[PDB]
Amino acid sequence: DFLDFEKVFSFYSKATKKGFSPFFVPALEKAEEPAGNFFLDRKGNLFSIREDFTKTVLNHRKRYSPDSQIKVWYADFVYRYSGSDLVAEYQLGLEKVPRNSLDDSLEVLEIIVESASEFFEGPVIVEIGHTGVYEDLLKEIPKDLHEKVLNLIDTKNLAEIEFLSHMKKIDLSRVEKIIEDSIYRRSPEHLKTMDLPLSVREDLLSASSFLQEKFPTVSVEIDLTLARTIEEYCGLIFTIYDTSSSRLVAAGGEYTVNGEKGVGGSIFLEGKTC
Amino acid sequence: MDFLDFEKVFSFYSKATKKGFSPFFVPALEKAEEPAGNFFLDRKGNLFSIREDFTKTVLNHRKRYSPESQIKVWYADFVYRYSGSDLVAEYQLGLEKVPRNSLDDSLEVLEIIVESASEFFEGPVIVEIGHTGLYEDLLKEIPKDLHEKVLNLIDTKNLAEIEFLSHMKKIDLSRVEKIIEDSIYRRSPEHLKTMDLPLSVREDLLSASSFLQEKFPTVSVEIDLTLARTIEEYCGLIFTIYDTSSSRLVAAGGEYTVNGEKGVGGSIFLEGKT
Amino acid sequence: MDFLDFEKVFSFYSKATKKGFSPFFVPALEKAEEPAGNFFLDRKGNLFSIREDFTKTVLNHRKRYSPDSQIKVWYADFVYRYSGSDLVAEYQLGLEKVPRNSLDDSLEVLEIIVESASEFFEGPVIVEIGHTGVYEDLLKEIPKDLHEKVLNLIDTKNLAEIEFLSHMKKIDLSRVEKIIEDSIYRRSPEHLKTMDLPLSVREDLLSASSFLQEKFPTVSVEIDLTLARTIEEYCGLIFTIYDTSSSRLVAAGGEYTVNGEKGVGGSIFLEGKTC
Amino acid sequence: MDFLDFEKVFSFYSKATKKGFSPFFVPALEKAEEPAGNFFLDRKGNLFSIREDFTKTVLNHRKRYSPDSQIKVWYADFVYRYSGSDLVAEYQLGLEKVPRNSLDDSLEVLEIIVESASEFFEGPVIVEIGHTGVYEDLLKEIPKDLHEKVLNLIDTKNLAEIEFLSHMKKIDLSRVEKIIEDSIYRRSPEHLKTMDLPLSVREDLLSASSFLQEKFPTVSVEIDLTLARTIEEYCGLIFTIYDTSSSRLVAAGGEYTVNGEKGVGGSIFLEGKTC
Amino acid sequence: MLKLAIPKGRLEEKVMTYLKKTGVIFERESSILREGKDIVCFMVRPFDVPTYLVHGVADIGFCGTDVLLEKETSLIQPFFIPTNISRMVLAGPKGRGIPEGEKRIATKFPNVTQRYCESKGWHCRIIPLKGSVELAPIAGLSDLIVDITETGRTLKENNLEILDEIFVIRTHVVVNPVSYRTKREEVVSFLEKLQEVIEHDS
Amino acid sequence: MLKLAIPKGRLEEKVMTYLKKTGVIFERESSILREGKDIVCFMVRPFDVPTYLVHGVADIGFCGTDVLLEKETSLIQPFFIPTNISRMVLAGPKGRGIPEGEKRIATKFPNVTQRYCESKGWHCRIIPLKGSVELAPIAGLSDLIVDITETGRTLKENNLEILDEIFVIRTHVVVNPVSYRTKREEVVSFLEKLQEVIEHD
Amino acid sequence: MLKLAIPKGRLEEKVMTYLKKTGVIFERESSILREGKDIVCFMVRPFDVPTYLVHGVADIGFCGTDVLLEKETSLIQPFFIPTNISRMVLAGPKGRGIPEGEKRIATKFPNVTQRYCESKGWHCRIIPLKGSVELAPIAGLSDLIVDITETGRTLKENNLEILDEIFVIRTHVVVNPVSYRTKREEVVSFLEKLQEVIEHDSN
Amino acid sequence: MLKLAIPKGRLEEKVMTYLKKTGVIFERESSILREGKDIVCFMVRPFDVPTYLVHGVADIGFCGTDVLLEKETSLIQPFFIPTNISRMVLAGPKGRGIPEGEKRIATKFPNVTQRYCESKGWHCRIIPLKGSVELAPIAGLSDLIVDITETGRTLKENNLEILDEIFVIRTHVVVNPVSYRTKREKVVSFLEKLQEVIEHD
Ligand SMILES: N[C@@H](Cc1c[nH]c[nH+]1)C(=O)O
Ligand SMILES: N[C@@H](Cc1c[nH]c[nH+]1)C(=O)O
Ligand SMILES: N[C@@H](Cc1c[nH]c[nH+]1)C(=O)O
Ligand SMILES: N[C@@H](Cc1c[nH]c[nH+]1)C(=O)O
Ligand SMILES: N[C@@H](Cc1c[nH]c[nH+]1)C(=O)O
Ligand SMILES: N[C@@H](Cc1c[nH]c[nH+]1)C(=O)O
Ligand SMILES: N[C@@H](Cc1c[nH]c[nH+]1)C(=O)O
Numbered sequence A: 001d002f003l004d005f006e007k008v009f010s011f012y013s014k015a016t017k018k019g020f021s022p023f024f025v026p027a028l029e030k031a032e033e034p035a036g037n038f039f040l041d042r043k044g045n046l047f048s049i050r051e052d053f054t055k056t057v058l059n060h061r062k063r064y065s066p067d068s069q070i071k072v073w074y075a076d077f078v079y080r081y082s083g084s085d086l087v088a089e090y091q092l093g094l095e096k097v098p099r100n101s102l103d104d105s106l107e108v109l110e111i112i113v114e115s116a117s118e119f120f121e122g123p124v125i126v127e128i129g130h131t132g133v134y135e136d137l138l139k140e141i142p143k144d145l146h147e148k149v150l151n152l153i154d155t156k157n158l159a160e161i162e163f164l165s166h167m168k169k170i171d172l173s174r175v176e177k178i179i180e181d182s183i184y185r186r187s188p189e190h191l192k193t194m195d196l197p198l199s200v201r202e203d204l205l206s207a208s209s210f211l212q213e214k215f216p217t218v219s220v221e222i223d224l225t226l227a228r229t230i231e232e233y234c235g236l237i238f239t240i241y242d243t244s245s246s247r248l249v250a251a252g253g254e255y256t257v258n259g260e261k262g263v264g265g266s267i268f269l270e271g272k273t274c
Numbered sequence B: 001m002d003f004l005d006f007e008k009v010f011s012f013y014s015k016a017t018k019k020g021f022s023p024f025f026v027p028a029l030e031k032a033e034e035p036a037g038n039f040f041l042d043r044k045g046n047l048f049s050i051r052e053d054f055t056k057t058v059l060n061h062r063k064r065y066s067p068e069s070q071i072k073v074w075y076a077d078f079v080y081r082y083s084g085s086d087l088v089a090e091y092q093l094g095l096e097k098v099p100r101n102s103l104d105d106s107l108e109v110l111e112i113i114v115e116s117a118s119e120f121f122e123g124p125v126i127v128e129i130g131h132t133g134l135y136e137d138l139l140k141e142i143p144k145d146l147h148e149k150v151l152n153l154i155d156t157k158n159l160a161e162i163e164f165l166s167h168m169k170k171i172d173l174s175r176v177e178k179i180i181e182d183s184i185y186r187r188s189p190e191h192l193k194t195m196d197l198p199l200s201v202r203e204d205l206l207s208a209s210s211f212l213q214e215k216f217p218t219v220s221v222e223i224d225l226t227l228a229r230t231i232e233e234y235c236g237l238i239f240t241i242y243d244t245s246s247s248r249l250v251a252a253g254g255e256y257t258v259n260g261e262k263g264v265g266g267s268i269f270l271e272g273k274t
Numbered sequence C, D: 001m002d003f004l005d006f007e008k009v010f011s012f013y014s015k016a017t018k019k020g021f022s023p024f025f026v027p028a029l030e031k032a033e034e035p036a037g038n039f040f041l042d043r044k045g046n047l048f049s050i051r052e053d054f055t056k057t058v059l060n061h062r063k064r065y066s067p068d069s070q071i072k073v074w075y076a077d078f079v080y081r082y083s084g085s086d087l088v089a090e091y092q093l094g095l096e097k098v099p100r101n102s103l104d105d106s107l108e109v110l111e112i113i114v115e116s117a118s119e120f121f122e123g124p125v126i127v128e129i130g131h132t133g134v135y136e137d138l139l140k141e142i143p144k145d146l147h148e149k150v151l152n153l154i155d156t157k158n159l160a161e162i163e164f165l166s167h168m169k170k171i172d173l174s175r176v177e178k179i180i181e182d183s184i185y186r187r188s189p190e191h192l193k194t195m196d197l198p199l200s201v202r203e204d205l206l207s208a209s210s211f212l213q214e215k216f217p218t219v220s221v222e223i224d225l226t227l228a229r230t231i232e233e234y235c236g237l238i239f240t241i242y243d244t245s246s247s248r249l250v251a252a253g254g255e256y257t258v259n260g261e262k263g264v265g266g267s268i269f270l271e272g273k274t275c
Numbered sequence E: 001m002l003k004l005a006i007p008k009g010r011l012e013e014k015v016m017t018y019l020k021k022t023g024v025i026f027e028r029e030s031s032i033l034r035e036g037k038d039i040v041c042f043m044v045r046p047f048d049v050p051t052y053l054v055h056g057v058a059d060i061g062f063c064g065t066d067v068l069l070e071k072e073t074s075l076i077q078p079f080f081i082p083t084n085i086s087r088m089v090l091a092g093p094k095g096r097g098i099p100e101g102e103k104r105i106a107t108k109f110p111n112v113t114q115r116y117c118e119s120k121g122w123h124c125r126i127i128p129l130k131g132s133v134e135l136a137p138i139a140g141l142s143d144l145i146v147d148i149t150e151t152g153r154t155l156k157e158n159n160l161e162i163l164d165e166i167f168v169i170r171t172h173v174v175v176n177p178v179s180y181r182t183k184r185e186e187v188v189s190f191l192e193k194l195q196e197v198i199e200h201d202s
Numbered sequence F: 001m002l003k004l005a006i007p008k009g010r011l012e013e014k015v016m017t018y019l020k021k022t023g024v025i026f027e028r029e030s031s032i033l034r035e036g037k038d039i040v041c042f043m044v045r046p047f048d049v050p051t052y053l054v055h056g057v058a059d060i061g062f063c064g065t066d067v068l069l070e071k072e073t074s075l076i077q078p079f080f081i082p083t084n085i086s087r088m089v090l091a092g093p094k095g096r097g098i099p100e101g102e103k104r105i106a107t108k109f110p111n112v113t114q115r116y117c118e119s120k121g122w123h124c125r126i127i128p129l130k131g132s133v134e135l136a137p138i139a140g141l142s143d144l145i146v147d148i149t150e151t152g153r154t155l156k157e158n159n160l161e162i163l164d165e166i167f168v169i170r171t172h173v174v175v176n177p178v179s180y181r182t183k184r185e186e187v188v189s190f191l192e193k194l195q196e197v198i199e200h201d
Numbered sequence G: 001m002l003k004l005a006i007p008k009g010r011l012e013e014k015v016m017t018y019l020k021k022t023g024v025i026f027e028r029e030s031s032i033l034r035e036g037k038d039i040v041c042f043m044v045r046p047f048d049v050p051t052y053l054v055h056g057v058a059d060i061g062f063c064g065t066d067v068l069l070e071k072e073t074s075l076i077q078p079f080f081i082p083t084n085i086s087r088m089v090l091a092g093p094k095g096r097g098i099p100e101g102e103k104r105i106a107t108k109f110p111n112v113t114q115r116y117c118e119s120k121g122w123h124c125r126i127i128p129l130k131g132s133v134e135l136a137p138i139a140g141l142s143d144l145i146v147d148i149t150e151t152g153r154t155l156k157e158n159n160l161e162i163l164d165e166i167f168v169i170r171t172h173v174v175v176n177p178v179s180y181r182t183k184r185e186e187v188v189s190f191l192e193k194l195q196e197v198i199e200h201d202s203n
Numbered sequence H: 001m002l003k004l005a006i007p008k009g010r011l012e013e014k015v016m017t018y019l020k021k022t023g024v025i026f027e028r029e030s031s032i033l034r035e036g037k038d039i040v041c042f043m044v045r046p047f048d049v050p051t052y053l054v055h056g057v058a059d060i061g062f063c064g065t066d067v068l069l070e071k072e073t074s075l076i077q078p079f080f081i082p083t084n085i086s087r088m089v090l091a092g093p094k095g096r097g098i099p100e101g102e103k104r105i106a107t108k109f110p111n112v113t114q115r116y117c118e119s120k121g122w123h124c125r126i127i128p129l130k131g132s133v134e135l136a137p138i139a140g141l142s143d144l145i146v147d148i149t150e151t152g153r154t155l156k157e158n159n160l161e162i163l164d165e166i167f168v169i170r171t172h173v174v175v176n177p178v179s180y181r182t183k184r185e186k187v188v189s190f191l192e193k194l195q196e197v198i199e200h201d
């Protein structure tokens, strides 16, 4: 039952009406030198496989002439390992580079959320985060230990935060608060009561607002615990889940690779129990 | 930036689904167990095969192994091949219809592909028809140790070498000679009656010829029985399409038998890459 | 730090280049044309085999020479293998004579490997002799597809499954039982006359046992006709050497045929090393 | 069949063990964590490097030791390299000593190699010595932008491109030219007191020359300060030996800097093979 | 519903007793599957807990730091199940120190020890075992072990010394991160109820 | 002095009791070591008996056919310990039989299921588990399992059907092949005592 | 329109003269390019002829069997250009036979000799050269060579013996298969006239 | 004896005439090999000079920067053969710039251009040719070429403009680095004469 792959033409329509050009590359890509996961062949070629669409897009940007503005959409397999098994999953995605504003990222969110909303039946949840916290959190916390708290935040291990709180004698109350709010106060209105830098509040307010106004039937939730995404993203961060099938249906965010900014997102037709 | 004329894929989709062709998308890479020349070795130890032919993929892959019917399908994706020691990829659009119950199934595939060709290419289109049949027939009386080279000779239209062969081997190859000559001077279907072929071969060529010429008076349907090359891969009617405008081979396919089965497919070529 | 008693290598080289064996040193890696078995792929497209069997190696290099040549070599290098999924290597000393013209040729090999082993290892050493010509004679009396199983049982000295096979599938395997039981209780060469054995097999065992016993009065020469898995790889007499001190297998060799071609060879393991 | 003058390995072995080197033998293929140029993949996921340089192998093996180890070792094995897209292998005899306590250690190394070469090779042997310390000095007064270019010119003895640069840039190359000109006309060690050298660099060459020249009357001891190529493999004095009879580079080594310390080594090129 | 992946072994009774004090009834109590009205319990082996969570075949599970780290598992671990303190340690025969040659090590945790070796930049042969790992040194099967310790009785019996403390172990309730959002209401109710009962036991 | 790798679990008691009947006295005992004059007993998990034997670190051991076939291991198998019949079996949910094409199989015995799939012309995804293997089809994880049965209790209690007997399991005493020659008078004299006590029962 | 890939060197004059005898008038010329509204000639090296045809950047070329076999290139071959007999051969120094180790082989034809060495089950180092191949056994660059021979004059003037005849070589006119169809009326007219011209010199 | 690898073609008369002026007497001569009792030269192709010098089958040779760089050969180069200055350049159709992404580049100089592409982070498909490189842009075999130029009339004739200098070219005398130590009395005598001749010109 390949038939889900029709949603691609729908996605293609959304993205072209918004200025997105189709981006299509082979799954294998020749590599100057070995860089992690690779395949070699009997002819002395070394290849990398598509593991990350946005890395692939940025890397093709380097091939092209100076500057190069880029507003593309893709639809293809992304390969990954689980243990030592090569695994593929189809993805529909967007990429814009630079993000000139917030409206660019919001255009990106609009297209991906509108898609998820059509492609999956059953309550959809839009979880929004922001890399720009963390730096606020850690800078009342001793430098060594930063790796630890960040971990505990990602895992939502309130318990062990209370333990470090007592055994090392530092008040971690706002860390405890972010974790707590990610459980009990996920409504955007609780941003008011959260201690964050003006620009993080703002981005969060206008993303939560824009999504709310546009999508009355999707649950727009805030969760600032996704600390692992700290060094792949820089700014707004989002994730979509499908309740009906209980799975992770989409992800993306703002990013900043070697100067200059971008946003991108991706949808996984099915995939992701984790 | 790795643009792909995606309207064409849409248009091909609209033409295929209008006739009950369903989608078919699978990862390009595949797990192999035994090393088969064109393999890839990964850092994990797995050994892979890369998609080189869609009809093989369509057969192995899904085909509901155990009981139950007909599979139509269209696909759009990279097919990979080696040019010398380089890996290159063709983005193909194609159709597979297995089982091949009758010439009707072949004319339905041809109708879609040829319709897509005259729409996508902007300059007189040539639809060349052949039949894998008439080979066992010539060769009939040529000694077995000469079959290989006579087939290559017919493949490359080396009329001079054949006439030299004929004389040096004191063998009548006039029947082979006439076929090469016809492939040059008697390519109009209106010669099929004048041609020495087995009945079932001529009838297939006539019916396909009548229909194509009636439905696509703008294309030029021509008969060419050389192309010995397609026997170790096709079984029955065969076709190729040429765009006189850009001077390329723009499509090919035909009937095949993969053990007791029988199918037809075909592929439009729109993009070389990498 | 990756130390070798190279005195042992020089010594072995003296023993060999006196019997007319000549040195044979080749690269561990060798370019292959087809992805057979354990291969190695290279950043240039090359496939390689890695030296897994010295006789297999010496034998390919003979075939590169196509007027056809009497090879009498000794070697000293790593032989590589897999332990689950890690490549390990054993440092080996060995001989190879192709063609074997007589038992006297096999005895010369034995004499160097045994003498080498009794001087390289502390322990009172055991030379266990076998012969591959025992199995054919043993097998038919016994049903066809009960063969490659009663071989596994011989190999495994599964005397209990044999006695049970002797009843559940009505057949006499009493001479199978005797071979096993001998290999436990009467391994002394002296018992070779007690044994029901094809004539040529018995002459070969008797002359080897004798030869070794007379020349090496401080090694225990014993006779053991199990280890049927040497069948698809050896052809004629077979030997293994154990050190009771290290409690390890220390040497192994034997007669073999490669396409109407008789040779003998023997290896010693000083061994070690992880790749 | 793949003969090797083992009488020469044994000779080398005696020479080395008399001076206290221990044997160093390890497999040709080692595990690697991450990819580093030439590498090999097996059907098991393992990634391997191949022995491309003994001293690098000796060191990346000595690092597996907590207190660090005092290492004094001779080898004797194949070293691998690509010639085109083909794997080739050369059998090398070498020495490696880390720490280098003084010059006496380096000279000890030069004594064995040089003596092995004078015995292993017919035609007059040339032992050409240099020093890495000479280049700091040289480059001190020349722009940074054209350091790498000048060092290549001096390594190629391209006296003409130097002079052309003396004129297109307007620098005193002067000193670089002397060094090239000297490496053709004033190779004799007697000219070392007239060479405009850092006093330390002069002391080491003076002393290595003497020692060699006194102990080796039939060899031609020569000094060549070009060989900028060695500038980041070695740190101190270097040497190369040539055999005039055949016409080849037969031995090479020198002093090097190993993270914290000093070590010396050298090797002899005694036989080339394929794969 | 809510599918739980309970580890068989030392914790089984503890966890299952917490579940009972929570209002859970099963009506299918099999040795390996406790199926209930609004909760099903897979009685799986501890190493396997993570497998069940990451494929989403369970929503909640109970794990030690040791299996989580050994499995590269990346979930949500809100609070612990009380448990005596244990530790993952490197250990070897008394007064032998770390052998420098190629360090031979046995574990039930090849992964954890394969990483430990990388971090110390060692070259080591990992001998995987299923239990009785403290024998390896005594028997000559390894020069070293990496295994769990609590009191250090087993270690002093087998004349082993702690040569290093790698990490300390605690038993976590763990949650698959998607069902924490998809079945959020269910999860949070059950997790509050669970946590309230652990709390009764001061 | 010979060393024995004895397997912890439903075998420990049987083998230990036989040893006691042989007249073995232990002197020093831990949960893991049994050490008497002339004999030491390494108390180990059943899968690791081959690894204690293969490595020359124990002279004698006791395994079932399952552990022996899951480790490619090479060793002498003189006689067996009498044991209630059990077999390795391929299984899957009741009725539904063998849904093929792509086959996913959960086991405690990866090696045994590999070798099994191959010798069936099968393309299959092995899921290793440490136990509760019978549970995988109910959950999302596999379509089939391979595991050990004796009563049929467990399979029918979880609505699973034997789909193929792979092999009957018996437990063997096994000897280090080397130490069979290097210590044979002591190995044979011990093994003779053991054999006579089991035979007598 | 018709693009011809013409092989510079030995065949140039013969072909160009065939072209003239056919009606071709150029009106525009250089070392490299000869045009003439209806016809273009690319003056290329013989080795590159298939690479021009195979990519369909020229429609008709002229080639020896040697370059066709060197580039695993298959394209339509209607008739031959008549020339003197030549053979691709194996050769080594006079009466010294085949060396028994890893054989060193020099050649302009690395792909042909790689295939020869396999088919003969051989271990060989291939040293590519661009010419003067008959040195190399003399110089010590190689044990053997694979080269072209016609008489044997060059082989013997340098003390070499033929040791194996690999294949005999003829000169083909070749056509780019797709343009055989896209521009067939033109191709056939040209080939028809060209074949007439080769039967009025009488070959 | 000294063996020289002499480049056939453009430089062939220039060098041979320099040799004449040094007293070099050949007794045997052939299109391909020229032998004197003390000096023999191999008349080989210019690209093949370095491969005669690397294997030490010749002691001295004469070749350009282009060949020296195209084979990554490092041998000694004492002084030059006087010649008109030329440069390896990148060229393409006039005005047509540089295509983004996949650059097809035709050249007789595969390595140099492969290296050049690496240096500018280019993805480029390289089409090796044996000559008449300036075709290909027209023809559409390539978008771009990497070729040698001096006067520029060849590129101008074919409507190509230069897009980048890669390196300036000179021709050198080159010496096998071992032959120089190993028979230096002779190499140095010969080079000295060789230089004296060139200076007089
Ligand atoms: N940190 C462990 C749990 C833990 C840490 N400390 C105690 N327990 C984990 O990754 O789940
Ligand atoms: N806030 C809870 C975490 C939790 C949410 N749901 C259940 N537990 C605590 O005190 O740790
Ligand atoms: N002894 C037979 C039966 C068996 C195997 N394992 C246990 N019993 C065998 O070789 O397999
Ligand atoms: N390996 C011997 C062991 C034995 C003891 N007693 C009798 N047999 C065998 O089974 O025959
Ligand atoms: N491939 C060509 C080459 C040839 C053969 N004979 C002359 N030329 C053919 O076989 O027709
Ligand atoms: N392949 C054809 C080409 C041709 C001949 N005449 C005109 N065109 C043949 O030789 O018959
Ligand atoms: N081989 C010389 C060629 C050269 C330099 N400058 C001009 N030409 C070099 O690159 O150094």
Ligand SMILES: N[C@@H](Cc1c[nH]c[nH+]1)C(=O)O
Residues within 6 Å of the ligand: D157, D158, D159, D184, H077, H078, H079, H175, H180, H187, H188, H191, H192, H195
């Ligand atoms: N090989 C020296 C020879 C020489 C220099 N000057 C005169 N002769 C060089 O070319 O630099």
